[PDB]
């Protein structure tokens, strides 16, 4: 089980610094070479650099050179990449990518496990936790949809789960909107059978990292 | 006498393996047995007979078939690192109480089959000092980097195995002691008479057959697969 | 239960490597002791069913049926004869093994002639092991303290048409540090080792 | 740089069907140590990327063996056999012979799947949120196929224009279908004005438009 753990969202000010981190699980961490790439919002993809855990080698995209540094500590297998002079077009998830050869192979210019990745936005605007609301089941529910609102946060994301992750079939995330308040909203549905509104219990999990909110809202008929 | 297949095996982590074994003794007992440093030899399985099988000390994710006399497949059903050990086939003939052992299969489990390197195989030749001072020469052969530990060396004066004036480690030596995927190094001397080792006629190899991959394996690394195959090294006499 | 003398016995050439074996179980009938050389199989070579003596070659097995207890001698011993040696004991046609004991014939060196050489490389003059030969058994290999250089225990080798047989150790490195004069510097070596001057570029 | 060039940019196909992506490199990439580190890479939505090919036609353990790749110089192709729905995606090709990496602009695969109309539900605004002062009302748009899709709010009978945003989900990749969710955000002063909350859907596995109402407020 190769598994890479990022550090949390956060947002940051034009001409702050962001580090963030990647704690590898599952493999020898020294023997791989780990790199960063990033993806802005709807954007494509951009390699950064990378830090050879065994012997701090590293290499690195011009385009950051300046700004962009690479550490690990070896103790709690984790790699850093630090982004200086944050500027408005830096907001990206950035994920780290493990190279696939072992033990300074070449096959390190080609990535098989990746981290979640880490959303950064670069933005003057406060934190804010959201408000979770619930989309309960129509009393004129065959299948019956329900979820849940999540309304005024900010920045980006928010990760929604329900029944702590035993319900997956039927659920759509959505999108995102921005709304003329500056903050975000998004909703969650799942469809069920309408027979099972009256057993089962249905609670959504929404987490938004950024500013530490973890609620786990009640759905049920009115 | 008891035959086993195969002498090697590496494996990666929930991989499926049989481990062959048969005898033609006509012998009714047959049974599996692990050979672990400390520990002892510990009895899996074991077959009274025919069609009859049954649990030994260490069952734990091993299945035993006794379909006729003669075969006792041993099955790895998805291997783990802790089942990385030497594993022996008995067989008595169950009616003398005397029970053969099998050559054995050394298996080696690892959770990534990346770990596998074949050997660098060097010949150091006789020094001019040995040869002066004692009227012998001494050859030395090393096998570097190899992982895992399953290996057999081998030395050869003019297209013919010897046997006499050798002595190979009987265990290697860990690169890196410390950790568990470390590589493995092996010495091997032949020492002749110098008058040997001084005619150019004379040809020495040393061989070490290293059992790694299959070639049906996959591989991903810019290196060549490291497959089971012979590595060698030469030295040529000398009237220096 | 099977239990054996503890390991590893250092026997000399010629000497009788003395081993012994306990039981528990009172009812057990048949006893046997396996040879097992170092990456090989355990081979049968002794069996014994009744109380007293067995001889066979070398070999002296003994059974005492009261006292639950096993032997096995190995008279006029010879460096061939290292190997691990397993009790085995059963009641009737499982059989209970022990853990063994290793046993370590060391050869009797008349001449000794101890002396570190350096042998290079047929394919690269500059890659080189130090080769500690000659010496008697009293001169026990201490294995590397820096862990970039690598030392090989003794090993015996015989010239069977010449009846000659001689120890050796191997110790190499990739360090610039490394050299024959300090190769074995970790171990207690004779005073007289001979240290020939290597061949200068 | 290397630039990296992919076409088409945008795939639409039939599961069954065999697909193909060109990459195009502004530079051989050929490595002086022999080889040729062009890969493909694939990101499926929400997902982080996951590699298929590297070094030009060598499959990853694990993909499919209907991917495959080819070619040599400066041009690339990836192939799929016969496309499954589970493909639906953005696909890169990346060099990574020179630094820095490069990957291409991403070649989005569209699957074609026959029309399905949306199931349409609407959801009135909680009475926690009423408390603080606005109302939310949702209309849920489930599994349909085209991903175009109209949503007209109503309220007392009156058109909305102006009070409600929408988003929409990528392509499923089991049923290859979108969903749509519409909030209509209003006061709960003007919330308790109305009696009849509407969503009007109009698609084309419609044949007349479909409108989920609810009365309170
Ligand atoms: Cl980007
Ligand atoms: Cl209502
Ligand atoms: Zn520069
Ligand atoms: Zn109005
Ligand atoms: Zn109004």
């Known amino acids: 089980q190769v598994q890479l753990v990022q550090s949390g969202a956060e947002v940051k000010k034009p001409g702050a610094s962001v580090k963030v981190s990647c704690k590898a699980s599952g493999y020898k961490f020294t023997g791989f070479v780990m790199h960063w790439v990033r993806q802005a919002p709807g954007q494509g993809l951009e390699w950064m650099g990378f830090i050879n855990p065994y012997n701090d080698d590293i290499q690195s995209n011009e385009r950051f050179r300046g700004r962009v540094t690479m550490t690990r500590d070896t103790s709690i297998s984790t790699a850093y990449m630090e982004l200086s002079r944050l500027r408005s077009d830096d907001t990206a998830v950035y994920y780290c990518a493990r190279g696939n050869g072992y033990n300074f192979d070449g096959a390190y210019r080609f990535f098989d496990f990746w981290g979640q990745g880490t959303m950064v936005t670069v933005s003057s605007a406060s934190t804010k936790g959201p408000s979770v609301f619930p989309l309960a089941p129509s009393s004129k529910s065959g299948t019956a949809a329900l979820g849940c609102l999540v309304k005024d946060y900010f920045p980006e994301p928010v990760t929604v789960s329900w029944n702590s992750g035993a319900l997956t079939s039927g659920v759509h995330t959505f999108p995102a909107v921005l709304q003329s308040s500056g903050l975000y909203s998004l909703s969650s549905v799942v469809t069920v059978p309408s027979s099972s509104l009256g057993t089962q219990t249905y609670i959504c999990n929404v987490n938004h990292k950024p500013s530490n909110t973890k609620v786990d809202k009640k759905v049920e008929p009115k | 006498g008891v035959t086993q297949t195969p002498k090697f095996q590496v494996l990666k982590t929930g991989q499926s393996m049989t481990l062959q074994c048969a005898q033609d003794?006509?012998?009714?007992?047959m049974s599996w047995y692990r050979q672990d440093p400390g520990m002892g030899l510990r009895l899996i399985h074991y077959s009274v007979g025919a069609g009859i099988t049954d649990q030994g000390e260490v069952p734990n994710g091993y299945n035993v078939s006794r379909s006729t006399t003669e075969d006792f497949p041993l099955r790895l059903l998805s291997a783990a690192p802790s089942q990385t050990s030497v594993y022996f086939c008995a067989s008595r003939p169950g009616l003398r109480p005397e029970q053969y052992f099998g050559p054995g299969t050394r298996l080696t489990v690892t959770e990534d089959l990346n770990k596998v390197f074949p050997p660098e195989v060097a010949v150091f030749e006789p020094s001019e000092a040995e040869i002066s001072h004692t009227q012998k020469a001494t050859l030395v052969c090393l096998a570097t980097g190899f992982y895992p530990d399953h290996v057999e060396l081998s030395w050869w004066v003019n297209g013919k195995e010897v046997h006499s004036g050798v002595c190979t480690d009987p265990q290697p030596l860990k690169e890196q002691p410390a950790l568990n995927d470390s590589r493995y190094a092996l010495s091997s001397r032949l020492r002749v008479s110098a008058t040997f080792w001084q005619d150019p006629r004379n040809h020495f190899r040393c061989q070490v057959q290293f059992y790694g991959l299959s070639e049906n394996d996959e591989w991903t690394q810019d290196r060549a697969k490291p497959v089971t195959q012979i590595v060698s090294a030469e030295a040529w006499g000398r009237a220096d | 239960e099977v239990e054996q003398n503890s390991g590893p016995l250092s026997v000399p050439e010629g000497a009788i490597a003395s081993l012994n074996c306990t039981y528990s179980?009172?009812?057990?009938?048949?006893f046997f002791w396996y040879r097992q050389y170092s990456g090989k199989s355990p081979e049968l070579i002794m069996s014994?069913?009744?109380?007293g003596d067995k001889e066979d070659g070398r070999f002296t097995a003994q059974l005492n049926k009261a006292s639950q207890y096993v032997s096995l001698l190995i008279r006029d011993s010879q460096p061939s004869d290292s190997a691990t040696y397993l009790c085995?004991?059963?009641?009737?046609?499982?059989?209970?093994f022990g853990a063994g004991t290793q046993v370590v014939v060391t050869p009797d060196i008349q001449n000794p002639d101890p002396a570190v050489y350096q042998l290079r490389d047929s394919k690269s003059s500059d890659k080189s092991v130090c080769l500690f030969t000659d010496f008697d058994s009293q001169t026990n290999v201490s294995q590397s303290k820096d862990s970039d250089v690598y030392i090989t225990d003794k090993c015996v080798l015989d010239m069977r048409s010449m009846d000659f047989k001689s120890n050796s150790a191997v110790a190499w490195s990739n360090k610039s540090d490394f050299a024959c004069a300090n190769a074995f510097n970790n171990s207690i070596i004779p005073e007289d080792t001979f240290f020939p001057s290597p061949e200068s570029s | 740089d290397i630039v990296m060039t992919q076409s088409p940019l945008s795939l639409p196909v039939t599961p069954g069907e065999p697909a193909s992506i060109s990459c195009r490199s502004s530079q051989r990439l050929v490595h002086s140590n022999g080889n040729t580190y062009l890969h493909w890479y694939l990101q499926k939505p929400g997902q982080s990327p996951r590699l298929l090919i590297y070094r030009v036609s060598n499959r990853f353990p694990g993909v499919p063996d209907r991917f495959s790749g080819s070619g040599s110089g400066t041009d690339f192709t990836l192939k799929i056999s016969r496309v499954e729905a589970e493909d639906v995606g953005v696909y890169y090709c990346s060099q990574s012979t020179h630094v820095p990496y490069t990957f291409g602009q991403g070649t989005k695969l569209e699957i074609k799947r026959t029309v399905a109309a949306p199931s349409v539900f609407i959801f009135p605004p909680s009475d926690e949120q009423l408390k603080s002062g606005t109302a939310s009302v949702v209309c849920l748009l489930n599994n349909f196929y085209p991903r175009e899709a109209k949503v007209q709010w109503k309220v007392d009978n009156a058109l909305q224009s102006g009070n409600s945003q929408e988003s929409v989900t990528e392509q499923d990749s089991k049923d290859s279908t979108y969903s749509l969710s519409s909030t209509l955000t209003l006061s709960k002063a003007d919330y308790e004005k109305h009696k009849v909350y509407a969503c009007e859907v109009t698609h084309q596995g419609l044949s007349s438009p479909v409108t989920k109402s609810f009365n309170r407020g």
């Open positions: 014994i069913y009744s109380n």
């Open positions: 179980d009172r009812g057990s009938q048949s």
């Open positions: 003794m006509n012998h009714e007992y």
């Open positions: 085995a004991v059963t009641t009737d046609s499982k059989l209970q």
